[PDB]
Amino acid sequence: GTTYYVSSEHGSDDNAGTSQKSPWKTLNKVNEIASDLEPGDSVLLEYGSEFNDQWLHIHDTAGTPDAPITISAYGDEAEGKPLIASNGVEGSQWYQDYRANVGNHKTRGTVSTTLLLKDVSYITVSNLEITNDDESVYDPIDTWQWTDTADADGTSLDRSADRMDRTGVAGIAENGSTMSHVTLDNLNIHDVDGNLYNKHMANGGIYFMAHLPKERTSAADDAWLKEHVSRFDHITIRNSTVKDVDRWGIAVGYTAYLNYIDKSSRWQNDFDYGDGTIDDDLIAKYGATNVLIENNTIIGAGGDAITTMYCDRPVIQHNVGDRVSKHINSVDYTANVLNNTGNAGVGYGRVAAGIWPWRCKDPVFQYNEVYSNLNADHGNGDGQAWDADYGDGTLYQYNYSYGNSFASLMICNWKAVNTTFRYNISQNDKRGVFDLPSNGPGNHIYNNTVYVDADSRVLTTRSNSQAQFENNIFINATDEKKTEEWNIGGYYGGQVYDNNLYVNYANTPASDANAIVADDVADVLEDAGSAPTAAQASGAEYSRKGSTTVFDGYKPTTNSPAINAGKVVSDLNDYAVEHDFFGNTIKGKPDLGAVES
């Protein structure tokens, strides 16, 4: 098919636009043909371009498996990725409507979006700079700090509950068809100044949600509704940066069809989650398939870094979350949050975790780093790196958490079931490592290494529910031997421990008939607590290849009591043991903790 060139500085809207020799100047020539773009068509924006007060709204078109549509850059890479900068302009706005009740949230309203993909399939978008700046909002994460009062050091926030929602990239399905094979690659998304509060409008860095294609009046409409399902398949977001956005970093899969998955009777925000189990057929039919989120960097999101929602077996890997929950605090999150009818309340949704799933089935979170999730001591009711939330079969493996305000992992309330947390390193995670607030059963927590400083402890004090703890290394990183509270509460049997390593503690858990005790961590691990304290300058995950890595301190010493000392785990959630934190195969009786020497 056809290739179109646009050059902010060298082009003219009087050119044919079909040649680098004679390119267009503005995105309005692209907006005009957007829905007529065809398989194989490309739109190439020239490195060094700035499209200020402009936007790209592509709708109701598709590539083919063999001829996809491409939005990318052309020219001298060194001039910097072409910038698209809508700046909130009225021309960037559109009307969002789920067309049903999809939670006690604002789910209906005006949205400013720099790059909107509405029912577009088989499209790749790459190599773009995307902002949605409000010059009247300034709160950069690079120089952010906790201030007792609002708007100190010439920061400025709009705390309005009714602040217009903004997104850098919005993926919207509302045709009752599958929106499939969307690739976002190597986008630099920043300064998307959305609503501080709203969780389920297209409000943040990147947001994909599905709407009903028409209102549902009564049960009589289900037969039709269930056969024209707006949903996502094969969404990939990779190599992208999302920085200084409100509220969400990356959110994929919130859907009107949650009324089928969450079994609403009246469709009046009334739900039945059953035992927390989610049927395969249900999440596959009404939710999102083949969602892949990899090699991204999230810095200073107002709320959560990355959240998969109503996704079937999504894969979230090699991503980095850095200093999120910036705006989830008592000074910034002040207003009485909107619903569609009135108020959801003051402090409603004043909670955020790092990288996690909402009502997903067997999501895989592997090879991710999360640093210093913010504000647990200033009004953030979460502040964890990881949150096995409402959902079934969450797998967290091979992840690094550092310095999070409140704990490494949460497992959140009654309908959070069948979680595996294995081969993860937690270092300097504050006020707890494991957060077990009223969680459901089936949770297996094994072959983790957890470095517990004097500002933390093994369990959050509010922990009260089920966890099977095996082959862990617990390190009391203080100057005396601590008597730890190994056990709080009894929901679904409470915390059961077997065959873990307890370093520099004065006691072991009552339930652990197979405890390994060591007084000195230096007889166990090469250099515990020595992994990094902040994300690599580049935003990439630190390397885990070579003779030398930043994680080498978690390697067991040559005659470590960790070596071959684990029980052989039977994973309670049908997740086969394969390798350790570094990709080293597990050989024989596993080594205690997250690293096979």
Ligand SMILES: CC(=O)N[C@@H]1[C@@H](O[C@@H]2O[C@H](CO)[C@H](O)[C@H](O)[C@H]2O)[C@H](O)[C@@H](CO)O[C@H]1O
């Ligand atoms: C079980 C629970 O309450 N978990 C909290 C999450 O709250 C829900 O999130 C979904 C969005 O995917 C809806 O907004 C739902 O109505 C909320 O109750 C919360 O999202 C996270 C962090 O933001 O932490 C838990 O406390």
